[PDB]
């Protein structure tokens, strides 16, 4: 399977960038979370970035911290998340699915065993938020052995050695956080990095259009989707309608 390459191939013949929502699995419940994901896909999401609720997400802001708590309140566990992942994949065979993990959940039952389970349910990539490239050797080797693409964040304070490493070790796409952007995009293209998705503060259509214009292959909406869920917790049918409105607005912005 190589869903990212196929996705980026068709996106480029159609001169579009990718729009990628992030959402916490099981937020606010298991069944509402599955309807949210089906809504995001049918409103035009090109791929999905899914979080597994973890007790101590030191790499996440408050919006996500509360999503995790909503999911834990709902009783969501990693095992249930993997069951959810198999259902999603069964309904949507071609959309790429990336997980945003914390290291302890990957380490818990064995690193190889975790990446085996990802391949079994048809997950395409894994970002481990608290494993820098310097520590990533056991993680990305397990990922490659199980045909999982390892995703690395390229931060604003990245020097050249970091970009070289990110370009060699990552697959699928590069998680870009915001030195100038166009220069960062260009250095990554020089080093043959996976296509770069911009993932900092992507809240409006004009930001989606900016990133594609700046040379990025697309944009990840890191939390703007979780706030629509938070805003509309009491009216689930309002929540879906505004999710559909937002996503199709953001995805229209990617056709430059």
């Amino acid at each position: 399977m190589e869903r990212y390459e196929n996705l980026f191939a068709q996106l480029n013949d159609r001169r579009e960038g990718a729009f990628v929502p992030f959402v916490t699995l099981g937020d606010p419940g298991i069944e509402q979370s599955l309807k949210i994901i089906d809504t995001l896909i049918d409103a035009g999401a090109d791929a999905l970035e899914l979080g597994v609720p973890f007790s101590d997400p030191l790499a996440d802001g408050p919006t996500i911290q509360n999503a995790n708590l909503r999911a834990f309140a709902a009783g969501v566990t990693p095992a249930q998340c993997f069951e959810m992942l198999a259902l999603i994949r069964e309904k949507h065979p071609t959309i790429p699915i990336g997980l945003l993990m914390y290291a302890n959940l990957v380490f818990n039952n064995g690193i190889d065993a975790f990446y085996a389970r990802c391949e079994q349910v048809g997950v395409d990539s894994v970002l481990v938020a608290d494993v820098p490239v310097e520590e990533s050797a056991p993680f990305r080797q397990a990922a490659l052995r199980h045909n999982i693409a390892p995703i690395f964040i390229c931060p604003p304070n990245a020097d050249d050695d970091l970009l070289r490493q990110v370009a060699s070790y990552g697959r699928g796409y590069t998680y870009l956080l915001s030195l100038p952007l166009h220069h960062l995009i260009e250095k990554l293209k020089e080093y043959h990095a996976a296509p770069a998705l911009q993932g900092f503060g992507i809240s409006s259509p004009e930001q989606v259009s900016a990133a594609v214009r700046a040379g990025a292959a697309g944009a990840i909406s890191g939390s703007a989707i979780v706030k629509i869920i938070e805003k509309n917790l009491a009216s689930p049918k309002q929540m879906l309608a505004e999710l559909r409105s937002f996503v199709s607005a953001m995805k229209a912005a990617s056709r430059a």
Partner: protein
């Protein structure tokens, strides 16, 4: 990539979001050069001596060992400015900050003792200080919060998660990832991502250096065992470090057993937890079978850390140090015994170490043995806690 090994055996590492690595790399480099700088060591030792009160006494207990062949000494870190050993390392981290040209200090606290230590070093040395605290811990420790405010520090409550220490450790780190140009993260124990387990040990090691010189002066021989409680591991590794190569000296760390290991309500990850990756390190920790991270429990809030410094996990695995647990009740009894027989009120944290020494002595009263307990703090902060239990019992 780093100047020093970030691992002790298989434990340790730098498990942080990519964005925080330059902060850690900059901190390691400044620490390495400060360690080679006579001027830094002189300013450090000056503050420890003329401001904090070092060297601390080494007290021979007169009455507590009567009727046995145990000789017991207490390293008196309760006599340190602030009442606890924490003061040593925050003075060092604040000099480090200034040496880096930083002007702001970030810290996390639970019981409040690390917050107070950070606020006092920050006031002395001209740093702006902001402290994160779990809102549960905030009102449970409003005396310490008032202290921090009196010393000029900004106290910021955390409600995220369980609103305790571990959720305080998380929000300080997000602050630092944005502010590390101007601000320094003053981590409160000998754990977390490298270089912090190394830095805190080196800024606490004078405890064991002094103890060694004092015991040789007074008894002419090294002790049979030195004993310290182990919340995160800083006071214990500060006592241990200078003896690690004197292989005839036992190293004994005492984890809080809470209501008892078999009850699951304890704070003993090193012997009763399981290796995982959290807070920037690979180490034993309190975690669920799914891999979520649980809270410690101990009657002493200062041993509330659900993991343990990685060097302690290393020393255990190679068998150089031994780790035991002591329950709430055992520590309470040791607290009462020290007050009544020596006129010293120990911190309930330190009481866990003492409680194990009393066990060694009482189980084998004819065994000749020379024991040093690190009295990591005084117990004024704990009289209210001990009072309520004692009248709730009778």
């Amino acid at each position: 990539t780093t100047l020093l090994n970030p691992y002790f055996g298989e434990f340790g590492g730098m498990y942080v979001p990519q964005i925080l690595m330059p902060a850690l790399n900059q901190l390691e480099e400044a620490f390495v050069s400060a360690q080679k700088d006579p001027e830094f060591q002189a300013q450090f030792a000056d503050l420890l001596k003329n401001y904090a009160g070092r060297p601390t006494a080494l007290t021979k207990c007169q009455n507590i060992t009567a009727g046995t062949r145990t000789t017991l000494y207490l390293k008196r870190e309760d006599l340190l400015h602030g009442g606890a050993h924490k003061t040593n390392q925050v003075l060092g981290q604040a000099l480090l900050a200034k040496r880096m040209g930083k002007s702001e200090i970030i810290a996390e606290t639970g019981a409040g003792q690390h917050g107070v230590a950070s606020a006092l070093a920050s006031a002395l040395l001209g740093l702006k200080c902001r402290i994160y605290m779990g809102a549960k811990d905030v009102e449970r420790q409003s005396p310490n919060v008032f202290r921090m405010r009196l010393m000029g520090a900004e106290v910021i409550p955390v409600h995220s998660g369980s609103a305790t220490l571990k959720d305080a450790c998380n929000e300080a780190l997000r602050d630092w990832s944005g502010s590390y140009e101007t601000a320094h993260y003053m981590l409160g124990t000998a754990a977390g991502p490298h270089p912090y387990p190394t830095i805190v040990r080196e800024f606490q090691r004078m405890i064991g250096e002094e103890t060694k010189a004092q015991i040789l002066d007074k008894e002419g021989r090294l002790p049979d065992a030195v004993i310290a409680c182990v919340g995160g591991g800083s006071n214990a590794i500060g006592m241990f470090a200078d003896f690690i190569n004197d292989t005839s000296v036992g190293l004994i760390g005492v984890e809080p057993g809470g209501h008892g290991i078999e009850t699951g309500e304890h704070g003993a990850p090193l012997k009763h937890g399981r290796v995982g990756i959290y807070f920037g390190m690979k180490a034993p920790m309190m975690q669920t079978a799914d891999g979520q991270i649980e809270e410690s429990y101990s009657i002493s809030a200062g041993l509330d850390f659900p993991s343990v410094g990685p060097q302690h996990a290393y020393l255990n695995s190679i068998g150089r140090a031994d780790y035991v647990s002591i329950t709430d009740d055992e520590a309470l009894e040791a607290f009462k015994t020290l007050c009544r027989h020596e006129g010293i009120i120990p911190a309930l944290e330190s009481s866990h170490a003492l409680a194990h020494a009393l066990k060694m002595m009482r189980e084998q009263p004819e065994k000749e043995q020379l024991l040093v307990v690190n009295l990591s703090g005084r117990g004024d902060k704990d009289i209210f806690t001990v009072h309520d239990i004692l009248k709730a019992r009778g």
